[PDB]
Design a protein around this nucleic acid. Structure first.
Length: 138
RNA sequence: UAGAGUUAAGGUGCCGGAAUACACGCUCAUCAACAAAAGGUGUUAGUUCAUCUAGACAGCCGGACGGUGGCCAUGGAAGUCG
């Protein structure tokens, strides 16, 4: 259809779907904002309090969006319970572990996104992020 | 108790007798003429070391990249909170 600006904005996986910044940026532009937040409440249900965008593009009184912008909801979704953990494992704290096959299938995804030389490239890249989230490789 | 012979403590630009001398040197502020914590592109030298044609350093001039909003504090955290 005719689509106007693709409305990017840094936001939480908790805000968009609800009310606050969801409704007014599509409001006078002329969508049905509860069915926009219906589609986005597929994404921000599973991506619960994570760093995730959604592009609220102005279609024919419709919008649909589910965006993981980065490495974000790939590493913690590979943990299989995806909140944000609440900082590092060096304390009396930690997340769990990602499996070797589960962490490297993220690296098999971002190899059309990443410009990877060999198939050991984006492997170590996302293994850095694997220990960042308070997990590890298993 | 007195005139000579020789010199200490210390002086010679001038009031007021005696070098406006000699050699080398930082510095010329009239320094010379009190004062600490605490501090400085005046200005000079020695020693040790990073650094150097294996292109030192400054000014002027650029590339500001793909993954990507990496991850996580948190109401939110965004390279840019921990």
């Amino acid at each position: 259809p005719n689509e106007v600006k693709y409305l990017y904005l840094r936001a939480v996986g908790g805000e968009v779907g609800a009310s606050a910044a969801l409704a007014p940026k599509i409001g006078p532009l002329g969508l049905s904002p509860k069915k926009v937040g219906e589609d986005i409440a597929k994404a921000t249900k599973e991506f619960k309090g994570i760093k995730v965008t959604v592009q609220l593009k102005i279609q024919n009184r419709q919008a649909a969006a589910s965006v993981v912008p980065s490495a974000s909801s790939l590493v913690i979704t590979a943990l299989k319970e995806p909140p944000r953990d609440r900082k590092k494992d060096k304390n009396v704290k930690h997340s769990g572990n990602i499996q070797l096959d589960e962490i490297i299938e993220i690296a098999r995804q971002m190899r059309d996104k990443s410009f990877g030389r060999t198939l050991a490239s984006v492997t170590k890249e996302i293994l850095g992020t694997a220990q960042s989230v308070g997990c590890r490789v298993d």
